[PDB]
Amino acid sequence: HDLPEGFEFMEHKVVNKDIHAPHENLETLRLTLTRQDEFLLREEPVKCVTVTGTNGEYGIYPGHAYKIVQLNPSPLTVEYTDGTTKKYFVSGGFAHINNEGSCDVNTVECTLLDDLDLAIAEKELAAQQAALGSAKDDKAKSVVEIRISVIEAVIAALKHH
Amino acid sequence: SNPADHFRPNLKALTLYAERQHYVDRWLHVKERWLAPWYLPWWSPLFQLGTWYSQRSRNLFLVENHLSYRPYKFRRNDEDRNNPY
Amino acid sequence: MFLFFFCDLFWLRLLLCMYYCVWSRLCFIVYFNCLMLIFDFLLFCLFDLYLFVGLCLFLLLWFMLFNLYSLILYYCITYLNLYLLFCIVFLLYIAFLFLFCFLCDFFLFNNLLVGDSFMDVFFIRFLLCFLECFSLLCRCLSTFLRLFCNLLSSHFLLLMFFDFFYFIFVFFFYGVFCYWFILFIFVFCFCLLFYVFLYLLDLFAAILQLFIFCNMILQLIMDFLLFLLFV
Amino acid sequence: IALAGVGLGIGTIFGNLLVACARQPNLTKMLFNYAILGFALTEAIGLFALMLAFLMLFS
Amino acid sequence: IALAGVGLGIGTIFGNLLVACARQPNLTKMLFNYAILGFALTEAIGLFALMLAFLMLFS
Amino acid sequence: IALAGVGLGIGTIFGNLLVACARQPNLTKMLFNYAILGFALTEAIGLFALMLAFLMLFS
Amino acid sequence: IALAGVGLGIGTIFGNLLVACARQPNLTKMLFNYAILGFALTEAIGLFALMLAFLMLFS
Amino acid sequence: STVAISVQGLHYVGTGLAAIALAGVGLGIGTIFGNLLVACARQPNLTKMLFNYAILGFALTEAIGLFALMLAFLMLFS
Amino acid sequence: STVAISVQGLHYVGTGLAAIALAGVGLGIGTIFGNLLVACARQPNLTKMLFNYAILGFALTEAIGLFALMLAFLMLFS
Amino acid sequence: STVAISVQGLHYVGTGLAAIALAGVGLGIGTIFGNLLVACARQPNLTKMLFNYAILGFALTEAIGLFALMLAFLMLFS
Amino acid sequence: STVAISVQGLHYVGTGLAAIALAGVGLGIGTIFGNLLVACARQPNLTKMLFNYAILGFALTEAIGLFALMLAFLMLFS
Amino acid sequence: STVAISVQGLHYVGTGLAAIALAGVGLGIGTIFGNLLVACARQPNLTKMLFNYAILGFALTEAIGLFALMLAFLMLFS
Ligand SMILES: CCCCCCCCCCCCCCCCCC(=O)OC[C@H](COP(=O)([O-])OCC(O)COP(=O)([O-])OC[C@@H](COC(=O)CCCCCCCCCCCCCCCCC)OC(=O)CCCCCCCCCCCCCCCCC)OC(=O)CCCCCCCCCCCCCCCCC
Ligand SMILES: CCCCCCCCCCCCCCCCCC(=O)OC[C@H](COP(=O)([O-])OCC[N+](C)(C)C)OC(=O)CCCCCCCCCCCCCCCCC
Description:
Bound molecules: cardiolipin, 1,2-diacyl-SN-glycero-3-phosphocholine
Number of helices of chain A: 2
Strand order of the largest sheet of chain C: 2-3
Structural class of chain C: mainly alpha
Largest interface: H-I, 56 and 48 residues
Distance between the termini of chain C: 61 Å
Number of strands of chain C: 3
Strand order of the largest sheet of chain A: 2-1-9-8-5
EC number (chains H, I, J, K, L): 3.6.3.14
Oligomer: part of a larger assembly
Enzyme class (chains H, I, J, K, L): hydrolase
Protein name (chains H, I, J, K, L): ATPase subunit 9, putative
Keywords (chains H, I, J, K, L): CF(0), Hydrogen ion transport, Hydrolase, Ion transport, Lipid-binding, Membrane, Transmembrane, Transmembrane helix, Transport
Shape of chain C: elongated
Number of helices of chain C: 5
Main location (chains H, I, J, K, L): membrane
C-alpha cells in the first residue's frame, strides 16, 4: 500500500539548466509571485523585478545567477517590457532565482501598495511606540519592535511614491 | 653592547686549560693499561671497540692529501681571517 | 678549556625539595595534548606513543623554572645560547626520528611522495618529496630558533625600557615640584602602563612558546603514527 | 614602478567585471563599456609615467 | 610612484561600480555620477604628485 | 609617495559607497555625507605630506 | 619591479574568472574572452616597462 | 685613518621616509569609512554607534600618523 | 690601505625607515575597526564584547608600532 | 690600488630596514582580529574558542616580528 | 686606473633587506588564521580538521622566512 | 679621466634585494591556505581534492622562491 506524494499532482516543475550547456540570450524573466498558496502572477514574462532581501536590494533581470534570497518586510517592484510598473508590498518569505530565466517569489503576504493606507499606518506607529513604552518584558519589546519595523517600512514605502 | 652583556652566565667560578696532545696521550695510556692484560684477547669485542675506530680515524688522517692548507687547530690567534699562521 | 659554573636554580631546587617532600596532585599542565593523542574511541597504536610524556613534563618544568623566573630583574637564563638550544632540540627530534627509522618499515615513508599517480613523478612528486624531507629538518631548526629569538628579543626590550624608565624617574622627577608637572605625570603613567603590559606579554609568551616547542615534537611523532581499529 | 599600480588597477577592474557579468549577463554590454572607460583612465596615468621616463631617459 | 596609488584607486572605484551596477542596474545613472566624483578627487591628488615631478624636473 | 595611500584610500571609500548605495538606495544622502567626511580626513594627511614635500623643496 | 604589479593583476583577473565561472557556469566563453582582453592590456603595460628596461640596459 | 664626515642633506632624506608612513595611516582611514558605509546600509538603525566607533578608529590611526609626523619634523629642523 | 670612516647623518636615514613600520600598524588598526563595524551591523547585540576584542587587537598592534618607534627614537639619539 | 674602508654609520641603515618587517606583522595581526570580529558575529557561541585560536595566531605572527627585531638589535649594538 | 675598494659595513644593508621578507610571511600567517577563524564559525563540527591544515600552512610558510633569516646570518656574520 | 672601481661589498645588497622576493611567495602561500580553509568548510566532502590542488599551488610558488634563492646564493658567493 504505497501512497502518492503530494507533488505528483503538480504538473509545473522547475527546469534547471545543465551547467555544461550553451548560454542563451533572454529578454524576459518568468516571474511567479505567490501568496499563501495562491499565485498573483504566473510565469509572467517581465523585464525586471526588484526585491529587498536581508542584505539589501536586488534587481533581478533575465539570466540572473542562481540565488536564494530571504526577503524582509518591504516593497517589491515589477517592471514589464512594455514600460509598466506594478508595486506590491510583502511581509516576508523567500525568492528563488534560477539561471534558466525564472524567479519564484513566495511570500506569506503580498498586497498591492495601493491597498495600504498611510493614515492607518501612521497612527499604528504611534500606538505601537506607546505599546513599546508599556511593554512588560524583553520579549514583548522585541515583538513590538517587529511591528514598528514593518509599519515604518510601509510608511516609508508610501512616502517614496 | 651593554644590553647584550646582560645575557652571560653569572656564576662562573673556575677555568682550566689543557692541551689536546697531553690529555689524548694520558687517555691512550689508560686505554693501553686497561687493554693490556692477557685475560682480554685481542679478538674480544671490547678490545676492538677500544682500538679499531681510533686506528681507522688516524689512518684516514694520515692518508689525507689536501690541496688546501688547514691552519693549526691550537694557534695563539685564530681571529684574523687574513693570517692563517 | 674547561669552565666550571653553576645554574641559577639552587634556590628553586631548595624550594622543590622543601615543598615536594610530600605528594601533591597535578591538574594543570602547559602541554596537555601529550597525554591525549587519540580522541576517537576503539583506536589504538602499537607504537610507544606515550613515551614523550615524561620528557615533555621535565622540559616544561625546566624551561618554566628558567624563563618565567627570568622576568625578575638580574635573574639569569643560564642556558640562553643558540647552539645549546640546537643541541637540545637535536637530541629530542633526532632521537624520535631514529626511533621511527630503526623500526625498519620503509612503507612508513610512502606519504613523503606527495600527490597522486596523476602528477608527474620526476618533475613534481620527487621535488615535493625532496622539499618535505628538507622541511623536517627546517622544522627542527625553526623550533630552536623561535625559542631562542623570543626570549632574546623580549629581554632586550625589557632591559631597554627599564633603563629609560630609570633615567626619567631619577633625573626628571623634580618636575613634580615645577610648573610642568603635568607632562611628567603623563609620562610616568604611560611608563607604568607600558611596564605592566610588557610584563603580562612576556608572562603569556613564555608559556605559549613552551607549548609550541612541545607541540612541534608531538607533531613530528604524530606524523608517523598509525592507528588500528578494535574489532 | 608607477606601472605596477596601473597594471594592477586594470586587472582589478576586469576582475570585478567577470563577477558582475556572471551575476547579470544581460548587462554585459553596459558593463563592458564602463570597464573600458576605467581602463582609458588608468592607462592615461600610465602615459604620464612613461612621459616622465622618456623625458628623463632622453635628457 | 604616487601615481601607482592613484591609478589603482581609480580601478578600485570602477571595480565596485560594476558590482553595484550588476546588483541593481536601474541606479546606474546615479552611481556613474558618484563614480566620476571619486575619479575627480583621486586624479586631483595625482596632479599634486605630477606638479612636484615637473617642478623638480625643470629646476 | 605618501599620497599613494591617500589616493588609494579615497578609492576605497568611493568603491564601497557604490555598493552601499546599490544595496540601500534610500540612504544615499547620509552615505554620501560620510564619504565626504572620510575624504576630508584622508585629504588632511595628504596635505601634511604635501606640506613636508614643499618645505623640503623650497629649503 | 613594475612587473610585480602586472603579474599580480593577471592573477587577480583569473582568480575572479574562476569565481565567475562558478557562479555562472554557462557563460564561460564570454568571461574567457574578456579575461584574455584584460591580460593583453596588462601585458601591454608590462611590455612598455620592458621597453624602458632594455633601452636603459643597452644604454 | 680616522675620518669624520658630516653630510648636511641627509636630514632631508630621513624626513621624506617618515612621511611615507602617512600612507599606511591615510589608507587605514579609508578602510574604516569604506566599511562604515556598508555597516550603515546593513543596519541603518545603528548609524550613530557605528559612527562613534569609526571616529575612535580614525583618531587612533591618526595617532600613529602623528607619532611618525613628529619624527618627520624633528629631523627637518635638526 | 686601512681607512676608517664615520658618517654622522646616517642615523636620520635609519630612523626614517623605522617610521615606515608604522604604515602597516596604522593600516592594521584601521582594518580592525572596519571589520568591527560590519560585525556590529550584522550582530548589533554584541556591541561590547566585539569592542573589547577590537581594543585588545589595537593594543597588540600598538605594541608592535611602539617596538619600532623605540628604535626610531634610539637611532635618532645615537 | 687596494683600499679598505670601514663605514661605521651603515649599521643604522640596516637596523631601520629590519623594522620595516614589523609593518607586515602589525598588519597581519590586525587581519586576524578583523576576521575574529566578523566570525564572532556569525557564530557567537564559539567566541571563547575563536578567541583562543586568535591568540595562538597572534603569537606565531608576532614571533616573526621578533626575528627581525633581533637583527635590528644585533646591528644597532655592533 | 684599476682601483679596488672594500666597504666593510655594507653587510648591514643586505641583512636588513633580507629581514624585510619577513613582512610577507607574517602577513600570510595572519591571513591564514583570519580565514581559519571565519571558517570555523561556518562549519564548527570540523574545527579540528581545519586547525591541522592551518598549522600545515604555517609550517610551509614559516620555512620560507628561515631562508631569508638564514641569509641574514650568512651576511651578518661575514 | 678613465677610472675603474671594483667594490667588493655590493653583492650583499643584491642578495638582500633578492631575498625580499620571498615576501610575495610567503603571502601567496598564506592566501592559498586561507582559501583552502574557507573552501573546506563550504564543501568538506572534497577536502582531499582541494588539499591536492593547494599543494600544487604551494609547489609552484616554492619553485619561484627557489629561483630567487638561486640568484641570492649566486650573488652572495660570486
Ligand atoms: C684544582 C682546583 C679544584 C678543582 C679541580 C677540578 C678538576 C677537573 C678535572 C677535569 C674536568 C674536565 C671537565 C669539566 C667540565 C665542567 C662542566 C661544568 O662545570 O658544567 C656546569 C654544570 C653545572 O650543573 P648545575 O646545573 O649547576 O648542577 C650541578 C650542581 O652540582 C648541583 O647539581 P645537583 O644538586 O643536582 O647534584 C646532586 C646533589 C643533590 O643536592 C645535594 O646533595 C645538596 C648539596 C649540593 C652540593 C653540590 C653543589 C655545590 C655548590 C658549590 C660549592 C659548595 C661549597 C664548597 C666549599 C668549598 C670551599 C673551598 O648532590 C650532590 O651534589 C652530591 C654531593 C654532595 C656532597 C656532600 C658532602 C658532605 C660532606 C660532609 C663532611 C662532614 C665532615 C665532618 C667531620 C667532623 C670531624 C669532627 O656542572 C655539572 O653538571 C657538573 C660538572 C662536574 C664535572 C666533573 C669535574 C671533576 C670532579 C672535580 C671534583 C673536585 C673535588 C675536590 C675539590 C676540593 C676543593 C678545592
Ligand atoms: C601565574 C602568573 C603569576 C603572576 C605573578 C604576578 C606577581 C605580581 C608582582 C607585583 C609586584 C611585586 C614587586 C616586588 C618587589 C620586590 C623588591 C624590589 O625592589 O623588586 C624590584 C624588582 C625590579 O624592579 P625595578 O626594575 O624597579 O628595580 C629598580 C632597581 N634598580 C634601579 C637598581 C635597577 O621587581 C621585580 O623584578 C618584580 C617583577 C615581578 C614579575 C613577575 C614574576 C613572576 C614569576 C616569578 C614567580 C615566583 C613564584 C615562586 C613561588 C614558589 C615556587 C615553588
